[PDB]
Amino acid sequence: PKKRRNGGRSKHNRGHVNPLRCSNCGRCVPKDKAIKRFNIRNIVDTSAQRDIKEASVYSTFQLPKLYIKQCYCVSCAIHSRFVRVRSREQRRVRK
Template sequence: RTRRLRSSETPPPTTRRTFRPSAVVVAAMTFKRRNGGRNKHGRGHVRFIRCDNCAKTVPKDKAIKRYKVQNIVAPENISYFTEASVLDGYHLPKIYIKERWCIIGCAIHKKKIGIRSRKDR
């Protein structure tokens, strides 16, 4: 247990902190992405999700996410439904899907995103 020092006392030499410039020098390595490939920024931990392609666990902020909205009926069959409908102006329901992929490789493999040049990023 440590005791509190009085204002007139000086701390013992073992508790003094000395500055050693040789211990502080760190080689600056280059980094590929400013955000480290994540969208975490100040959070310590982010919950994990599963990839829709390979079922790999990946942090939620690192995953590639797309919100897909599509018609339940195929486009070539919509005219049949509108003709057979009793209600005028009836809108067919849509499917709302949140797609998540673990890495860019999985999203490119499923052809959901394409490779862009550096200036287009």
């Protein structure tokens, strides 16, 4: 077969597009190809968030965020459960 119609990437009307390096391990991967996860997260646990609110100066709580944008290569993402192997039909489904 040929598995990828589009090469696994935004190949269309472009030659070179820069590589980024994997967050897990530094593996080079094209930005068009790369597996991107935004990860908006708070540092706090639920009990910790309760303790910080109780400890807090002010009633008003700014809720400190983590803004990451963490990029994985294919090999890492499948190992670390950010993707699956899907199924031959399902490999085209953008949900």
